[PDB]
Amino acid sequence: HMFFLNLKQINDRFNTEFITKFKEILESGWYILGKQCEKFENNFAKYCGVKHCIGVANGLDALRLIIKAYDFKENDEIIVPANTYIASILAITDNKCKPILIEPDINTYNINPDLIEEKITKKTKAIMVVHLYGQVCDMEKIQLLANKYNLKIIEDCAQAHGAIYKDKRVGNLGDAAGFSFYPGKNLGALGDAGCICTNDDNFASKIRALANYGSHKKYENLYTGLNSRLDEIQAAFLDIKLKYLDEDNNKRKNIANFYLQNIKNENIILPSNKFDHVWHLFVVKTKLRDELQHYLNNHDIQTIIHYPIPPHKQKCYKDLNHLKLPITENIHQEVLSLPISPTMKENDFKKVADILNKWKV
Amino acid sequence: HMFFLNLKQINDRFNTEFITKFKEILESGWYILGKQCEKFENNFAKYCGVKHCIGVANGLDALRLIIKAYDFKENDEIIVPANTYIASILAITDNKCKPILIEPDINTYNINPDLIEEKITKKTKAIMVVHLYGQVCDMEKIQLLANKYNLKIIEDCAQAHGAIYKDKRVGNLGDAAGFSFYPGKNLGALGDAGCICTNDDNFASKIRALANYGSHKKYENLYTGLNSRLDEIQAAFLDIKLKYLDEDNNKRKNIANFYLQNIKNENIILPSNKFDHVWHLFVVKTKLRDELQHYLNNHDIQTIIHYPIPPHKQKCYKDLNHLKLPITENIHQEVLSLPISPTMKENDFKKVADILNKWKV
Ligand SMILES: [Cl-]
Ligand code: NA
């Protein structure tokens, strides 16, 4: 059985270092807000090319905390791609802001920048761009809109660790950026973990307070905060793995290229990489998606859908269910993710392509 | 230097097991919502005598999720002790409920049950009791009150793991209970961690979904949830230490009873317990508090204040600053915690007692 994402294969590379660092932390007696956190933050900040990184508890927390720190009014509006993972939307509604859902470009699976300005109102306060599946979104027009309309740009970078746009990295393309390090993400922890990146000194400081009980100083709560922290342990495991992230992303680039050069089936629409793509998910598109997933499972190849029900169609967002978002809807009906990971074996990726080429519907 | 809480000493007893279990989890390649979480939940449920235990990310989240799951209306009231740690109140306000702050009894530091009914209104939906410092609240009148008025009882158990009121454990004295397993708590993880305990089936299922993005099934989101999970690693660590928690609590009792029996100083009010007490914190009370903390520091003993500023006097809750809560206020001016731990050395507790006895002010 070929797994969609074999985390034991990904992480076995680092077992001895993981165990050493675990023993070190034991020796230290310090498990929360310690030297591993500081060191990982400083390294990931350098990696993204930003001044400040704040470790927090997970990627949803990361986005929720960014939005919280801005102190928007209830029902203030945040423009966001309609086809992102529901956690992007959860972060907006958690803060009692209104998600304003915008269709993706079929050629990027990212928000179509050309469709944003028409949905801007007096209540719009922010654009949340999502670098979906690993590809950076085209920022040129979004930055111009944010300047014109006094909007914040919030990046959800959970699927695109390390992706590059012009001279910069995802994480450094707007005002503040949220990352997940959920274990299955391009840089994965061994438990829940996240961070926030920004260049703004005051914002950074506010976010640190907000994620630590709203406290700058022992005893004292300046803000109504959260408990959203990155464990020393997880910070340590992340910093070991961070030294290999660009290499890991390049290994995914090699697999994606093999898929793109070798899969030739009229029933399958392959993904493109207009801008830099770190290939968190390798997403194909077909009218016979359920049939493809079943066929692949018959051939011992596990595949997962990202995603089959769009946020506006979820039961939790009943008041959005009526929205007509046909591009987003069609994508959800037709997409399927092929296995891909940095450590994936050649014989496994060749088999995936060969089996897809044999699929004759 | 005598540190207030020496977590290395606490945890060193378990290092070999921690490492064994970590490797086990590495072998599993499964770090989130797995067998370790299940096992620990099952065992902590048994320990509390409840049907259900849901591991979550921390004790503040535990309380926040509980209130969220009840789906109270905006500005619905939750009665809560005024002198608790601010997390208890954050859980209430994050949910857009109004906290109704009640004075503690000066001789228990817990909510005075006799002061609750007069503050019940048509908007009251719940009573949050806190078992402060490790002492269980006198629950009988509170349970009758909540029945009389159809209120939920929410227990904040973060300081009182394993305490017993009559025939039941804390965690099994209300409708739902929150626990922290912050490393410094009586059962502490090696990272942020928490749980919810309840006997109610629907409530436990609703909580699991709410803590997993609002998802009860793959691809679907029934609620607008958040991400509050207990890592497999931390669940395994906790399960190791749980097996010693009763033994350790009894060891804390021995040391607190040493303090109570051996400290005798006219400037110091000892925390004589009215009900069962597992002595998370050993809190003394004096008119010369800052002086005492300095004296002790001069004799190389570290103390911490739990707490110096009450929630209503915090900058994050300026709308509450006006409230006249003199018992709570006095307590905050006068309390100081002495070092206590189940592993604490005899010479060390004897020195604390000795140095306090010699203290003339
Ligand atoms: Cl076949
Ligand atoms: Na965590």
The CATH number of residue A60's host domain is 3.40.640.10
CA angle B122, B126, B129 (to 5 degrees): 135
A5 plus A136 within the same structural domain: yes
CA distance B206 to B332: 37
- B258 and B132 in a single domain? The answer is no
The nearest alpha carbon in chain A to B180 belongs to A227
Using CB atoms within 10 Å of the CB of residue B1, give its burial: 0 to 12 exposed, 13 to 18 middle, 19+ buried: exposed
**In 3D, which of A137, A98, A138 has the Cα closest to residue A311?**
A98
CA atoms within 13 A on the CB side of B262: 15
d(CA A325, CA A319): 14
Q: Are A129 and A92 contacting, i.e. CB atoms less than 8 angstroms apart?
A: no
Collapsed DSSP state (helix, strand, coil) of residue B269: strand
Query: Where are the extended beta strands (E) located within chain B?
Result: 52-56, 77-81, 98-102, 124-130, 152-156, 164-165, 168-169, 176-180, 194-198, 282-285, 335-338
Nearest to B183 among A31, A189, A315 (CB): A31
Burial class from Cβ neighbours inside 10 Å (0-12, 13-18, 19+) for residue A143 reads middle
Q: Which of B18, B86, B316 sits opposite A26 (nearest CB)?
A: B18
Q: What is the DSSP letter of B328?
A: H
Nearest of A169, A184, A171, A129 to residue A153 by alpha carbon: A129
Last residue of a domain, one of A227, A244, A261: A244
User: In whole angstroms, how far apart are CA A334 and each of A109, A267, A269, A288, A315?
Assistant: 13, 11, 10, 7, 21
Tell the residue number behind the tokens 């109504």, with chain if given.
Answer: A224
Per the residue annotation, which of B68, B98, B125, B185 is the catalytic one? Answer: B185
Q: Are B331 and B283 in contact (CB under 8 A)?
A: no
* Cα B211 off chain centre by: 20
Identity of the residue in A22, A94, A229 whose CB atom sits nearest the CB atom of B22: A22
Select from A53, A59, A95 the least CA-distant residue to A77.
Answer: A95
| Cross-strand bridge partners of residue A165 | A168
Q: Is the CB of residue A182 less than 8 Å from the CB of residue A157?
A: no
Domain check: are A238 and A292 in the same one?
no
- Spatial strand order of the sheet with A176-180 comes to A52-56, A194-198, A176-180, A152-156, A124-130, A77-81, A98-102
Q: Are A220 and B23 within 8 A, CB to CB?
A: no
Instruction: Please report, for chain A, how many H helices and E strands are present, in that order.
Output: 12, 11
Closest-CA residue to B45 (of B239, B190, B205): B239
Tokens representing residue A360 in the block = 């004759």
**Total structural domains in chain B?**
2
d(CA B155, CA A299): 51
Q: B33 and B116: one domain?
A: yes
Is-contact A107 A277, C-beta < 8 A? no
For residues B219 and B137, state if they share a domain: yes
**End residue of a domain, out of B228, B244, B260:** B244
CA B106/CA B331 separation, integer angstroms: 8
* A168: Cβ contacts below 8 Å, ≥ 6 apart: A49
What's the longest Cα–Cα distance across chain B?
67
User: What are the helix (H) ranges across A53-199?
Assistant: 59-69, 86-94, 140-149
Contact B146, B113 (CB under 8 A): no
Q: Which of B291, B190, B270 is nearest to A234 (CA)?
A: B190
Q: Which residues contact A175 (CB under 8 A, 6 or more apart)?
A: A152, A153, A154, A198, A200, A203
Checking DSSP bridges between strand A168-169 and strand A282-285, what pairing results, if any? unpaired
Looking up residue A282, the CATH number of its domain turns out to be: 3.90.1150.10
- Classify residue A183 by its DSSP letter: T
CB of A64 within 8 Å of a chain B CB? The answer is yes
CA B218, B197, B228 angle in degrees (round to 5)?
Answer: 45
Give the integer Cα–Cα distance in Å for B169 and B242: 14
Check residue B176 and report its DSSP letter: E
Whole-number Å distance between alpha carbons of A258 and B130: 59
For residues B132 and B83, is the Cβ–Cβ distance under 8 A? yes
Please give the Cα distance from B55 to B131 (Å, whole number).
20
A259 and A141 together in one domain: no
Domain identity same for B222 and B159:
yes
**For residue A152, what are its two tokens?**
């914040």
Angle of helix B59-70 relative to helix B201-210, nearest 10 degrees, comes to: 120
Q: What distance, in Å, lies between the first and last C-alpha atoms of chain B? A: 22
Same domain, A186 and A264: no
Q: How far is CA A155 from the centre of its chain?
A: 9
Please give the Cα distance from B69 to A343 (Å, whole number).
Answer: 41
Bridge partners (DSSP) of residue A337 are A283, A304
User: Is A279 found in the same domain as A215?
Assistant: no
Round to whole Å and give the CA distance between B22 and A21: 12
> Considering only CA atoms, which of B349, B247, B339, B356 is closest in space to residue B7?
B339
Both A283 and A189 in a single domain? Answer: no
- Return the closest-CA partner of residue A35 out of A45, A49, A47, A21: A21
CB contact under 8 A, A32 and B191: yes
At residue A16, what is the residue type? T
Query: Is residue A147 less than 8 Å (CB to CB) from chain B?
Result: no
Cα gap A42→A45, rounded to integer Å = 5
Answer left, alpha or beta for residue B105, where phi above 0 means left and psi between -120 and 50 means alpha.
beta
Name residue A101's beta-bridge partners: A80
Q: How far is the CA of B232 from the centre of ligand 1 (A)?
A: 38
Tell me B315's DSSP state: G
| A323 close to B (CB below 8 A) | no
Look up the domain containing B249 and give its range.
245-361
The identity of residue A218, as a single letter, is K
Residues of B with CB below 8 A from A234's CB?
191
Q: Phi and psi dihedrals of A264, rounded to 5?
A: -140, 95
Q: Distance between CA atoms of B55 and B42, rounded to whole angstroms?
A: 10
Count of beta carbons in the 10 Å neighbourhood of residue A105: 17
Beta carbons within 10 angstroms of residue B299's beta carbon: 15
- From B135, B81, B173, select the one nearest B281 (Cα to Cα): B135
What element of type H or E holds B247?
helix B245-262
Contact A315 B221 (CB under 8 A): yes
Q: Which ligand is nearest to the CA of B233?
A: 2
CA–chain centroid gap for A33, Å, is: 24
Method by which the model was determined? X-ray
Q: Are residues B90 and B147 in the same domain?
A: yes
As a whole number of Å, the end-to-end CA separation of chain A is 24
Output the CA A295–ligand 1 centroid distance in Å: 6
Which are the catalytic amino acids of A? Answer: 185
B37-44: list long-range contacts, CB under 8 Å, 24+ apart.
B37/B229, B37/B230, B37/B231, B37/B232, B37/B235, B39/B235, B39/B236, B39/B239, B40/B230, B40/B235, B40/B236, B40/B238, B40/B239, B40/B242, B41/B195, B41/B235, B43/B239, B43/B242, B44/B195, B44/B197, B44/B238, B44/B242
State whether B208 and B255 are in the same domain: no
Give the burial string for A308-334 (b: 16+ CB within 10 Å, else e): bbbbbbbebbeebeeeebebbbebbbb
Q: Which two tokens stand for residue B100?
A: 């109704």
3-state secondary structure of A200: coil
Of the residues B223, B314, B335, B336, the best mutation for testing chain A's interface (the one with the most A CB atoms within 10 Å of its CB) is B314
Pick the closest to residue A197 from A232, A169, A222 (CA basis).
Answer: A169
Chain A: give the shortest CA distance to residue B269, in Å: 22
* Last residue within a domain, chosen from A221, A244, A267: A244
What is the distance between the alpha carbons of residues B102 and B72, in angstroms, rounded to a whole number? 20
Closest residue to B90, CB basis, from A23, A224, A234: A224
The alpha carbon of A291 and the centre of ligand 1 are apart by a number of angstroms equal to 11
**CA-atom Rg of chain B in angstroms:** 20
